[PDB]
Amino acid sequence: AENLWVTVYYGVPVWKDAETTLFCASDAKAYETEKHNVWATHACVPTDPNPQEIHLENVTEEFNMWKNNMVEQMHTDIISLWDQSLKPCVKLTPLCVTLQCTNVTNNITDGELKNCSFNMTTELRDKKQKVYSLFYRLDVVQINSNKEYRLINCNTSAITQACPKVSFEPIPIHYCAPAGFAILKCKDKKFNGTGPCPSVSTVQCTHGIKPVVSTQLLLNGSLAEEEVMIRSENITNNAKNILVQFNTPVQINCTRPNNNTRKSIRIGPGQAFYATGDIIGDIRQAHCNVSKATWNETLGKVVKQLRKHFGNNTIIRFANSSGGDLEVTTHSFNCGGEFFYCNTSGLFNSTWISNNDSITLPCRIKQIINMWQRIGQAMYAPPIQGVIRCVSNITGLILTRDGGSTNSTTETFRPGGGDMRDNWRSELYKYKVVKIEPLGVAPTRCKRRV
Amino acid sequence: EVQLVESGAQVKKPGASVTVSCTASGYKFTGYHMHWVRQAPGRGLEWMGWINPFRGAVKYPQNFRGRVSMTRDTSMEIFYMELSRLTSDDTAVYYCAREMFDSSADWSPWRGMVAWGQGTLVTVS
Amino acid sequence: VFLGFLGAAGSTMGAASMTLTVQARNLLSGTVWGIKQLQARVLAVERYLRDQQLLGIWGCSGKLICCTNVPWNSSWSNRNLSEIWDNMTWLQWDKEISNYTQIIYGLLEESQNQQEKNEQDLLALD
Amino acid sequence: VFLGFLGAAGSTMGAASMTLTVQARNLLSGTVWGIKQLQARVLAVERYLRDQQLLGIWGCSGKLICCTNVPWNSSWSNRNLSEIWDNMTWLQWDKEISNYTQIIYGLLEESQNQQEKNEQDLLALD
Amino acid sequence: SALTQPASVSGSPGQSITISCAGSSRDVGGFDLVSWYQQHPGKAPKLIIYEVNKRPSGISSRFSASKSGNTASLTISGLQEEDEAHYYCYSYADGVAFGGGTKLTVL
Numbered sequence: 001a002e003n004l005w006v007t008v009y010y011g012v013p014v015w016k017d018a019e020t021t022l023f024c025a026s027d028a029k030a031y032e033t034e035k036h037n038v039w040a041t042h043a044c045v046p047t048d049p050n051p052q053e054i055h056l057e058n059v060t061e062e063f064n065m066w067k068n069n070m071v072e073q074m075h076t077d078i079i080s081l082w083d084q085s086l087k088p089c090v091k092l093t094p095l096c097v098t099l100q101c102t103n104v105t106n107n108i109t110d111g112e113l114k115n116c117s118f119n120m121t122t123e124l125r126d127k128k129q130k131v132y133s134l135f136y137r138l139d140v141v142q143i144n145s146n147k148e149y150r151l152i153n154c155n156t157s158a159i160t161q162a163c164p165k166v167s168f169e170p171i172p173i174h175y176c177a178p179a180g181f182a183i184l185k186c187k188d189k190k191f192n193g194t195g196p197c198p199s200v201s202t203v204q205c206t207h208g209i210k211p212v213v214s215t216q217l218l219l220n221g222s223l224a225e226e227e228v229m230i231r232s233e234n235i236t237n238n239a240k241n242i243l244v245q246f247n248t249p250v251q252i253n254c255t256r257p258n259n260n261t262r263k264s265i266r267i268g269p270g271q272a273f274y275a276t277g278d279i280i281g282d283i284r285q286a287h288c289n290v291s292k293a294t295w296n297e298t299l300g301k302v303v304k305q306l307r308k309h310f311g312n313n314t315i316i317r318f319a320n321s322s323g324g325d326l327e328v329t330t331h332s333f334n335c336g337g338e339f340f341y342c343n344t345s346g347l348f349n350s351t352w353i354s355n356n357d358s359i360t361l362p363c364r365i366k367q368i369i370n371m372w373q374r375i376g377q378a379m380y381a382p383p384i385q386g387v388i389r390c391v392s393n394i395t396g397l398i399l400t401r402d403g404g405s406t407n408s409t410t411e412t413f414r415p416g417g418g419d420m421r422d423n424w425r426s427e428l429y430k431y432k433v434v435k436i437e438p439l440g441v442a443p444t445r446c447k448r449r450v
Numbered sequence: 451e452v453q454l455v456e457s458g459a460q461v462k463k464p465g466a467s468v469t470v471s472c473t474a475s476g477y478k479f480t481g482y483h484m485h486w487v488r489q490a491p492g493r494g495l496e497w498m499g500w501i502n503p504f505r506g507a508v509k510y511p512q513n514f515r516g517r518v519s520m521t522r523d524t525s526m527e528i529f530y531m532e533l534s535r536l537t538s539d540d541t542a543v544y545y546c547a548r549e550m551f552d553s554s555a556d557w558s559p560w561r562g563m564v565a566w567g568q569g570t571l572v573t574v575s
Numbered sequence: 576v577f578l579g580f581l582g583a584a585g586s587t588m589g590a591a592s593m594t595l596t597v598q599a600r601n602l603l604s605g606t607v608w609g610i611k612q613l614q615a616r617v618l619a620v621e622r623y624l625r626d627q628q629l630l631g632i633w634g635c636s637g638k639l640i641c642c643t644n645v646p647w648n649s650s651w652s653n654r655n656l657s658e659i660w661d662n663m664t665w666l667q668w669d670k671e672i673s674n675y676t677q678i679i680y681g682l683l684e685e686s687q688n689q690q691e692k693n694e695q696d697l698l699a700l701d
Numbered sequence: 702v703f704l705g706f707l708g709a710a711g712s713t714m715g716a717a718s719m720t721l722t723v724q725a726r727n728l729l730s731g732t733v734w735g736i737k738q739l740q741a742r743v744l745a746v747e748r749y750l751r752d753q754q755l756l757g758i759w760g761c762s763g764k765l766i767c768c769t770n771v772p773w774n775s776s777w778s779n780r781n782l783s784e785i786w787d788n789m790t791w792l793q794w795d796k797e798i799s800n801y802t803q804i805i806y807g808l809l810e811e812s813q814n815q816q817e818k819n820e821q822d823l824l825a826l827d
Numbered sequence: 828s829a830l831t832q833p834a835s836v837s838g839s840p841g842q843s844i845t846i847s848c849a850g851s852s853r854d855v856g857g858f859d860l861v862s863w864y865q866q867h868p869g870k871a872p873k874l875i876i877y878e879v880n881k882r883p884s885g886i887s888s889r890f891s892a893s894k895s896g897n898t899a900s901l902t903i904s905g906l907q908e909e910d911e912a913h914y915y916c917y918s919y920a921d922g923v924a925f926g927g928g929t930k931l932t933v934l
Contacts, residue, residue: 004656006643006679008635011598013584013591013665023612043609058585058666072555077611080732084607156525176612179602179619202581215505238509239483239502239560323521324506373480373504375525404921405512407853416507421555438598440665441672441679442588443647445656448634450644450691489872494828495915497923511922545872561860561878561919566871614735617743624746625729627753628764632725636763685703689722692765696718699768700786 004443011438013056018435019069020181025205026173035167036088039211040081047174053203055187060196063186065429066233074175074428075421078211079372089163090271092380094121096154101147104134109283112137116149123269131265133275139368152368153378159368164274164382168334170220172208183431189225193429209427216331216344216415218396218426223247228301230309231429238401241417243426248298249393254288254335254363256388274382286388288342288361295347295359303352315410318348322400326364328418336388337381339366344415372420396426452476454546456568463575467532470570472546474527480504483549485563486520486531490542500560501529536574543569585666588659595639633688645682651675711790721765758814770817771808777801829854829924830899830916837934842906848899848916848926856897860919863892863901863926867912876901899926908933
């Protein structure tokens with residue numbers, strides 16, 4: 001009549017957070033790019049033909065990017081798959097033989113590269129081979145008359161060249177969840193990260209995210225909505241990595257106007273080293289043209305998202321990076337297979353107050369990189385034949401602030417930070433892993449039998 | 451054990467610069483923020499700057515921008531540091547110092563001075 | 576009306592416990608890298624079969640919604656049937672049961688069906 | 702009396718059909734070296750599933766107690782009921798079935814529920 | 828430095844001491860990020876307390892300080908001749924400012 005009992009239901013809308021293993025899915029088509037392991041697509045499940053979305057009526061739910069422990073899972077996953085695209089290719093520790101160098105076969109107009117001859121063990125163990133290559137000033141180092149050099153990993157590490165078959169363009173992947181877990185998605189547009197969301201939504205898997213190797217500029221990513229949302233885990237500690245999400249994208253049409261020669265060298269048997277041959281005649285430099293007009297408008301798209309952080313009438317300043325490595329002072333991103341570190345000196349430079357052309361960004365080039373900060377494991381990128389070009393939508397920024405400077409006069413803002421679990425997290429902000437608890441108790445007036 | 455090996459006395463002259471070292475030999479380099487700290491003979495100390503050794507994110511107070519240039523060597527594991535526009539007041543010793551909560555994934559802070567070196571004494575006229 | 580999956584989270588308990596035959600359809604259906612999905616599905620059925628046993632080692636035997644003969648003790652957020660069952664949402668009702676759901680099932684197999692289905696035995700052997 | 706999991710391993714079968722549920726808890730209990738546990742919890746369901754399928758086809762469906770309709774044809778270990786349920790434990794009597802436990806079950810699933818679930822739609826066509 | 832620390836403090840073995848550390852509406856009174864240090868005369872300096880009052884693993888719990896309102900202070904219980912040293916105050920403020928310093932000695 002009133003003595004309420006316990007009643008058992010199943011399939012309830014209840015959850016708590018818990019970390020466990022997610023897994024991959026990258027279409028039924030990306031498994032057909034060949035090239036021997038483009039990233040990780042191997043036995044991953046193909047992706048469903050139609051992904052739909054559900055908006056949770058009345059749900060007010062907490063979201064974050066910081067202690068969202070998928071920010072650690074994805075970095076550890078992208079780390080060990082890098083070896084799997086490497087271990088059946090060509091290692092090159094004997095390339096620590098000395099090269100006799102000189103400024104290149106040029107008509108001056110300068111060098112930054114050299115014409116370096118050296119001896120090497122070929123297919124036959126007894127036969128030695130004469131061959132010279134061309135390297136950038138970052139791939140080698142002089143050791144302590146003309147100048148002679150060594151490869152740069154030699155005073156620290158071993159090194160392995162990847163297969164030139166393996167291509168390296170960012171290809172999308174969906175992150176997955178099985179029977180018991182899911183991934184949340186707060187469909188707020190004006191979303192400053194912290195708090196319950198008014199119209200919480202959900203997804204079973206994420207959208208398509210590309211693991212773009214980039215510091216400073218985010219590329220091939222995801223846009224913002226309404227106002228260019230400014231995001232950060234912590235805006236007070238100037239040691240933290242701050243991530244901006246653009247709304248209006250910018251065209252980067254990078255170019256390496258040097259028809260490059262790929263000289264394959266036999267030093268195996270079977271294996272091969274890939275040297276740099278002649279560049280045809282004229283001598284030009286790798287840049288990265290950027291629409292001057294698009295930058296100036298997008299500056300206001302975020303600077304007017306800074307007057308909402310200090311003053312309805314105020315002032316904002318910029319200056320180039322405070323210093324450090326190329327990965328924190330220069331926009332690094334993959335272009336062709338070789339790498340481009342682009343000069344951020346000429347961008348962070350203006351001064352804001354109250355009431356058709358293009359600049360270009362100088363870019364250095366690197367082929368041997370010690371990425372992941374693994375002292376012991378450097379690599380060599382087999383050079384790209386021909387002129388290199390890469391169009392992409394500019395998407396975000398990894399940057400820092402200064403300290404107090406003069407308290408509230410204004411503040412200088414520079415690029416830096418770098419860390420690779422926060423380049424990833426620039427595309428992990430709107431998700432959080434949850435464990436689903438399906439059993440639910442209620443008190444209804446019914447009771448069972450004996 | 452760990453250590454912060456510092457250079458011996460490196461006396462230098464005004465209008466120039468000087469190099470002071472903190473060799474690392476026992477702990478993880480990249481993930482551990484490190485500060486340079488200055489101590490004058492019998493006076494108050496000045497916080498100089500710091501670095502994010504993972505690719506070297508350095509910062510200064512506006513006090514010395516244009517003067518100071520500060521960095522490290524990744525695989526040789528050490529901190530160099532220089533301060534330009536020397537004046538005789540700069541006669542002092544120096545100390546490298548680390549922060550508390552450092553790791554791999556989730557960061558913070560900017561505090562908790564634990565580490566100190568050997569006191570590299572330079573002298574300026 | 577066949578809306579979708581779990582729209583009734585900030586909605587009432589009955590409208591939630593309405594579609595008792597929707598959420599149980601797509602959960603099984605039918606080198607390295609091929610291992611992270613492999614370690615996900617075998618720990619996604621050990622827990623599922625832990626449930627398949629519990630609906631059998633009690634008296635329910637079948638599947639879906641079974642009621643119980645347990646004191647919903649008054650300390651557990653007592654409103655009327657109509658202020659709990661005919662009023663609240665699993666966003667606003669599950670916010671009140673959580674802190675003491677561990678005491679309810681310190682019994683759901685202990686002093687009942689363990690001794691209860693054995694009361695069936697000392698009976699049906701003499 | 703409640704003396705824990707497997708606490709009644711060798712007492713009278715009447716006192717041994719008590720704890721039928723505690724032994725129904727740890728049949729599911731929830732690079733390399735992770736292989737050491739992934740191939741272990743795989744064999745937890747294997748000790749459960751074998752009985753989930755057997756009891757399901759039978760008149761058991763659910764677990765715990767389950768009567769069956771098989772005559773213990775006296776050619777088997779014919780004994781007094783007191784010489785089964787009163788003077789023996791689980792071990793002392795599952796010893797006796799072993800001579801014929803490979804014969805008892807050409808019936809429970811093969812002669813009972815093969816035929817006693819097809820007169821449920823020659824009868825149920827009314 | 829930006830925190831006024833007094834001139835001197837001296838005593839007899841066994842006593843205890845208090846040292847004030849005052850700023851304005853910005854420094855010690857503005858923020859809860861302070862810390863105090865010890866310098867025995869001529870080696871590597873050492874931290875004793877961080878953040879108002881939380882000791883790090885190892886410091887003998889005769890030392891304890893705090894931050895109240897605007898004037899940070901400290902207290903060392905049962906002075907030994909081991910405690911005869913120089914002492915400071917830290918406080919992250921905008922960047923980092925400091926306390927002037929105060930030495931403890933044996934009378």
